[PDB]
């Protein structure tokens, strides 16, 4: 397939005065353990307590006195807020970064520690809370290069904590490492295998969220035209949506039966009622909202508005289809923003990062699921903001709608769990992305290591 050159994936290549920030009495041991390991490396440790739920203004007040205590000296902030499995932790973690930027303390590195955030070895799966932070973390690197340090995933302690400290004082810009008994691993993006002649053919009832969106409509026409027996489309306005009636009529012309319903995607009753009346054999989650707000202006409300349709939607579909044995397809439309990173879209990257983890957790649990981290989408309909605008200049090209759909069907054939399908001019991305923030992330890409000097 001509789109096999767009397939990438995430693999794991086995590779001063600190301020440990942690939730109210998170664990006397850990704090005592880290202090020791860090100090034995020429570090002057000073712990701070920041409760989950704390907002930026509050966090700024708690950090203010310890950050300015270093003056010109660099303060390496080691955050343990991510060890708490909750979205509140992610919210408070974002707040911590925002606060550090606000205090404007010259010289500072923020490192976010997590656990089970990413699955590096067989058996372990990515838990939501941690996966979200890594997503946001990558956006921070690009938005605040001089402030953001990196992400380190702990085993969850002698050598483990030891390796962790090494990463902090590492010589290589490995701002995405996973510490395991086997050792430390650095996140890498490598071209994925080929899809070839592999493809997927629709049958039975197909549920499509965000069906009145640019992707939604396109997906529907293609499915209905290729064997779908029934399509169930959900949208914010429902059948009263623009051209809703017109679209459904053309879709039934393919022989496919079509039903349209309204929903907030995250509304329980509305989705449950729908899968009850029309048990799906395949689910396609394209719902979501355009996000473009830099970290300094990322409000808590915006973070919720962004994850609502995306995260909440997929999680509800995950639970409402626990007894549906006929379900043999669970497709989540992610974004490359949550796998590679992209400035101005921190809330969007956290959300998409979560769709991917859900895919991983589902499959490893014997449940069908596929998560594709899309790049820029070709064609009519597709609204672009500051975020798409940034990816564009960096070297991403708008994939052809139809080609993109083929890539989907191709990925679904291979039965992928997570894959990045993006069209990129590496001879323009590698150098650009490196000018903002240097790193080892894309070194595993041939065309990337080429433009690099």
From TrEMBL:
Protein name: Tylactone synthase starter module and modules 1 & 2
Organism per entry: Streptomyces fradiae
Parent sequence residues shown: 1962 to 2449 of 4472
């Amino acid at each position: 397939s001509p789109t096999d050159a767009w397939r990438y994936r995430v693999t794991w290549k086995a590779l001063g005065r600190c301020l440990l920030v942690a939730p109210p009495t998170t664990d006397g041991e850990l704090l005592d353990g880290l202090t020791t390991v860090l100090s034995e490396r020429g570090a002057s440790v000073a712990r701070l307590e920041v409760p989950i739920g704390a907002r930026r203004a509050e966090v700024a007040e708690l950090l203010k006195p310890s950050m300015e205590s270093a003056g010109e000296e660099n303060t390496t902030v080691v955050s343990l807020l991510g060890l708490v499995p909750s979205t509140d932790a992610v919210r408070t973690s974002i707040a911590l970064l925002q606060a550090v930027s606000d205090i404007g303390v010259p010289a500072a590195r923020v490192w976010a520690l997590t656990r089970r955030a990413v699955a590096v070895v067989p058996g372990e799966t990515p838990q939501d809370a941690g996966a979200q932070l890594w997503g946001f973390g990558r956006v921070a690197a690009l938005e605040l290069p001089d402030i953001w340090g990196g992400l380190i995933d702990l085993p969850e302690n002698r050598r483990a904590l030891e390796l962790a400290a090494a990463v902090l004082a590492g010589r290589d810009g490995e701002d995405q490492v996973a510490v395991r008994a086997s050792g430390i691993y650095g996140r890498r993006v490598s071209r994925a295998a080929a899809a070839g002649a592999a493809s997927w053919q629709p049958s039975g009832t197909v549920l499509i969220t965000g069906g009145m969106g640019a992707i939604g409509r396109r997906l529907a026409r293609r499915l209905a035209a290729e064997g779908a027996e029934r399509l169930v489309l959900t949208s914010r306005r429902g059948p009263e949506a623009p051209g809703a009636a017109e679209l459904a009529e053309e879709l039934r012309g393919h022989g496919c039966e079509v039903v349209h319903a309204a929903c907030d995607v995250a509304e329980r009753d509305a989705l449950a009622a729908l899968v009850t009346a029309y048990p799906p054999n395949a689910v396609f989650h394209t719902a979501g909202i355009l996000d473009d707000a830099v970290i300094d202006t990322l409000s808590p409300e915006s973070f919720e508005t962004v994850r609502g349709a995306k995260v909440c939607g997929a999680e509800l579909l995950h639970q409402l289809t626990a007894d549906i044995k006929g379900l043999d397809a669970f497709v989540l439309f992610s974004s490359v923003t949550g796998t590679w990173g992209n400035a101005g879209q921190g809330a969007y990257a956290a959300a998409n990062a979560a769709l991917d983890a859900l895919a991983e957790r589902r499959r490893a649990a014997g449940l069908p699921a596929t998560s594709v981290a899309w790049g820029l989408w070709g064609g009519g309909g597709m609204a672009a903001g500051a975020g798409e605008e940034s990816l564009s200049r960096r070297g991403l090209r708008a994939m052809d709608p139809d080609a993109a759909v083929d890539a989907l069907l191709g990925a679904m054939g291979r039965n992928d769990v997570c894959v990045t399908v993006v069209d990129v001019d590496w001879e323009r991305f590698a150098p650009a992305t490196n000018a903002i923030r240097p790193g080892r992330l894309f070194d595993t890409v041939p065309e990337a290591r080429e433009a690099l000097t």
